[PDB]
Amino acid sequence: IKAYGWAVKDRTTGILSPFKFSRRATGDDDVRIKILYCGICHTDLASIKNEYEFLSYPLVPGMEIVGIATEVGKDVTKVKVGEKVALSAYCYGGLSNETVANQSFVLRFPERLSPAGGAPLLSAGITSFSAMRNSGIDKPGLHVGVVGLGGLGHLAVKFAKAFGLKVTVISTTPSKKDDAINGLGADGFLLSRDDEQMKAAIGTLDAIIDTLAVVHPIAPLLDLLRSQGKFLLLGAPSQSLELPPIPLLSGGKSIIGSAAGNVKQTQEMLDFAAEHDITANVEIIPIEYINTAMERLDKGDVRYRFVVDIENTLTPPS
Amino acid sequence: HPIKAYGWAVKDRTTGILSPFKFSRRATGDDDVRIKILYCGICHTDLASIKNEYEFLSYPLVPGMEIVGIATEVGKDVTKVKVGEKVALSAYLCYGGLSNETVANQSFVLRFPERLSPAGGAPLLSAGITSFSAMRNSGIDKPGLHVGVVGLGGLGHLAVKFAKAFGLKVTVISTTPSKKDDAINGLGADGFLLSRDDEQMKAAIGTLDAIIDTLAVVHPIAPLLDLLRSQGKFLLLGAPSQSLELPPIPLLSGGKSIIGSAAGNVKQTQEMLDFAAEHDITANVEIIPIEYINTAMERLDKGDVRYRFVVDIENTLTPPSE
C-alpha cells in the first residue's frame, strides 16, 4: 500500500523533491507494476511550470511508464506476473517506485524493444502513430513535414519513415540538420526562418505534423501544404492559435486534432514499433537530476528525450 | 571446482544437427567473470560450423558467439565488472553461447549499454563490430562519401545503419527486389541497386567511393569493382567457403584495393557499443526458442530472416531431460 517518489511540493517553485505516499491495494482486476523507467514529456514540464490549475498539491509527474508486472489480481488474465509491461496514460504518475492500474490500462511491452528507449512510445509514440493512421497519412510516397524536432517530433520522423513517407523536418535549430537527416532518416531539412527556402517549398507537402507546444504562426506552414493537404495538430499549446481563414479555405486544406487514445491502437503501435525496431533517442538520468533536466527540457537542451531511471536511482528514504 | 553446464551442440559434424548437450566449464579464476546467458545471436560463422566448413573445429561443437548476459560471479581480482551487471562477450575470446552460462577473463567482458535492447543488441558483438571496425580502420567514416553495401543480410543491414550514422550516402546492392522498401525506408539507405539489372549496374559505374561486401557465398566482384571510383576501396567482410576470382584488370587500372576486415580489438568493441548506444543502433532481430535452432539454421542458409536470429536462452533453454 505504501509507495515513494519525487514530487513538486510547491506549485510556485516547480522543484521536485523526495516524497513518500501510499497506494491502493491490488484489487481483483488490478496489476502490480514495478517501475523501471519513466519518460519525461512536455505535459510533465508544463505541470511543473504551473500551467495546469486542476493539479493536486503534491504532484508526481511522468506519463511514459514502462515496468514489470509483479502481482496480478484474481480476475487478471491477459497480464502475468514477471511480464515486462507499459502503461498507456488512459492520481500518481510515473516518478515513483511502483504503481497500480486496471488490467485494461496495461499493454505488453514488446520483447524486441529497449524498455528505456521504448518508454516515450507510450505518450509520444502513440500520439504520432494515431494521428498518422487516423488521418490516412501512412501511405508510401506522401511528402510530409514534421514541425519541431523535439521529443514528439523525432518520434514522428521515425514512424513516418517506417510508413514509407518522404519526411521534411521544419525546425528553428540549424545545428540539428545532421540528426534529422542522418540520425533520424529525414529526407530533407527546412529552416523555418529561411523565407527563401520556405517559399521554394510552397505547396510541396501532402501533410504537416505540428508537434510544437508554443503558439507560433501556422499561416506560413499552411502555405507549405499542397491543395487538400492535412495539417495535423499534435502539440497542446497553453494559449490558442490564430487560424487565418484566407489560406485555409483557398486550398481545400484541413486542420485535424490528435485523437491519440485507443489503448488497443496503442498495442498496435507497440507491435509496429517492434517490427520496425523503433525507439526514442533517450537520455537516461537519475531522479536526483530531475530538476536540472526540467530546466534543460524547458530550454530544449536534450537530444529528444529525458527518461528517468527508476531502476537504480529512486532511493528509498524510509 | 568445475561447474556443470548445458546447451545445444552438434554431436555429429557430418549431419550438423544440434541437440541437448551437457558439459562442464572451468571454475571462476581470480580474473574470470561467470556470465548467465540471456541472448545469443546466430551469425554466418555459426552456420558454416554447422555445415562442417571448418576442418580444424573440434566436436561436440556448441556454437554461438554474439552473447549478452548478466554477470553472476567474479574473481577476487575483478573490479571493472560486478555481479548483476548486464555484460556482453567479445567474439574473439571451446563451448560457445548456445548454453545456459559461460566464463571468461575480465578483459574480454564488455559493459552492455543501458539504452540498447539485449536481444537487438546481441548481433552487435560480431556483425556490429565487423562493420564498425572495418569502416573505422579503412577511413570510410567521413560524412559525404558514397558507399555501397553488398548483401542485405545480418551483417549488411547493420553495416547500413552504422554507415548512415557515420553520415555516409549508402546504396544497397542486392539480388532481392522485395528488399527495396526495408533498405530505403526501414534502414535509411539512399538508394537500392539491383545487381542483376545491367542497366542499373552500368549506370552506376565509377560512382562509389567504397564498397562493403558482406556476402558469404561465392560471387563475382568485377562488376562491383566497376562501381568504384578511381582509388576506391572494396571492403571484404564476408567469409565465403570457396575462394574468389580477382580480376586483375579492373583492380590495377583503377588504383583500387580489396581490404580485409580484422574485426577484433575489444577496446574497439566497447567503442562500437557506446557508439551504438548514443545513436540508438540495434539489429532487426527474430527472437526464437533454442528448440527452433535447427529450423532457424536451415532458414538462415537461404537468408530467410529479417535480419538476425537471436536465441532467447534465458527463458527457453532447459537441461537434457534432467
XYZ file of N, CA and C in Angstrom, chain A residues 128 132 143-161 165-172 180 184 186 188-190 205 207-212 221 224 232 234:
138
model
N 1.995 10.238 -32.349
C 2.376 10.263 -33.757
C 1.679 9.150 -34.531
N -1.151 9.869 -37.601
C -0.851 9.457 -38.967
C -1.824 8.390 -39.455
N 4.665 13.148 -49.192
C 5.656 14.067 -48.651
C 5.058 14.719 -47.412
N 5.668 14.476 -46.257
C 5.168 15.020 -45.003
C 6.232 15.918 -44.390
N 5.774 16.965 -43.715
C 6.637 17.844 -42.942
C 6.362 17.673 -41.461
N 7.431 17.581 -40.676
C 7.340 17.489 -39.224
C 7.837 18.810 -38.658
N 6.980 19.496 -37.910
C 7.299 20.810 -37.368
C 7.773 20.620 -35.935
N 9.050 20.902 -35.698
C 9.624 20.808 -34.372
C 10.327 19.490 -34.135
N 11.652 19.521 -34.037
C 12.425 18.309 -33.779
C 12.701 18.190 -32.281
N 11.625 17.942 -31.542
C 11.728 17.693 -30.120
C 11.491 16.232 -29.811
N 10.905 15.947 -28.653
C 10.604 14.578 -28.293
C 9.578 13.942 -29.204
N 8.398 14.560 -29.274
C 7.339 14.062 -30.143
C 7.765 14.077 -31.607
N 8.413 15.160 -32.045
C 8.757 15.288 -33.454
C 9.720 14.218 -33.931
N 10.790 13.980 -33.166
C 11.787 12.998 -33.584
C 11.201 11.592 -33.652
N 10.190 11.298 -32.832
C 9.494 10.022 -32.958
C 8.573 10.019 -34.172
N 7.909 11.148 -34.438
C 7.085 11.265 -35.638
C 7.891 10.963 -36.895
N 9.146 11.417 -36.940
C 10.007 11.154 -38.092
C 10.214 9.654 -38.272
N 10.487 8.943 -37.173
C 10.768 7.513 -37.268
C 9.541 6.728 -37.713
N 8.369 7.056 -37.164
C 7.145 6.394 -37.602
C 6.833 6.724 -39.054
N 6.995 7.991 -39.438
C 6.733 8.395 -40.815
C 7.643 7.654 -41.789
N 8.941 7.585 -41.480
C 9.870 6.882 -42.361
C 9.530 5.400 -42.460
N 6.921 7.217 -45.855
C 6.719 8.593 -46.274
C 8.053 9.281 -46.545
N 8.002 10.305 -47.394
C 9.096 11.259 -47.501
C 8.913 12.324 -46.428
N 9.973 12.610 -45.677
C 9.871 13.420 -44.469
C 10.794 14.623 -44.585
N 10.230 15.809 -44.383
C 10.979 17.049 -44.245
C 10.809 17.557 -42.820
N 11.915 17.904 -42.173
C 11.895 18.394 -40.800
C 11.956 19.914 -40.833
N 10.968 20.556 -40.219
C 10.882 22.010 -40.147
C 11.186 22.410 -38.712
N 12.306 23.102 -38.516
C 12.784 23.441 -37.185
C 13.425 24.821 -37.221
N 13.725 25.349 -36.033
C 14.433 26.617 -35.894
C 15.800 26.429 -35.244
N 18.577 15.138 -37.975
C 17.337 14.913 -38.707
C 17.567 14.012 -39.914
N 17.923 10.400 -37.829
C 16.514 10.037 -37.810
C 15.983 9.582 -39.160
N 15.344 11.555 -41.931
C 14.579 12.527 -42.701
C 15.207 12.745 -44.071
N 14.772 15.573 -45.846
C 15.098 16.972 -46.043
C 14.989 17.738 -44.747
N 15.628 18.906 -44.726
C 15.670 19.761 -43.543
C 15.384 21.193 -43.976
N 14.264 21.741 -43.513
C 13.827 23.084 -43.874
C 13.979 23.993 -42.663
N 4.004 19.916 -49.750
C 3.763 18.901 -48.734
C 2.341 18.364 -48.839
N 1.129 16.613 -46.230
C 0.654 16.773 -44.865
C 1.748 17.407 -44.018
N 1.327 18.039 -42.924
C 2.235 18.621 -41.943
C 1.869 18.068 -40.572
N 2.884 17.734 -39.781
C 2.705 17.216 -38.429
C 3.292 18.249 -37.475
N 2.418 18.996 -36.803
C 2.821 20.077 -35.909
C 2.938 19.537 -34.488
N 4.166 19.474 -33.977
C 4.442 18.958 -32.643
C 4.717 20.056 -31.623
N 4.686 21.321 -32.035
C 5.072 22.414 -31.154
C 4.039 22.641 -30.056
N 3.065 27.809 -42.373
C 3.090 26.357 -42.518
C 2.002 25.873 -43.469
N 2.799 25.684 -46.994
C 3.631 24.571 -47.435
C 2.824 23.376 -47.902
N -1.846 18.327 -39.240
C -2.098 17.561 -38.025
C -1.585 18.325 -36.809
N -0.649 18.163 -33.157
C -0.296 17.173 -32.145
C 0.138 17.781 -30.823
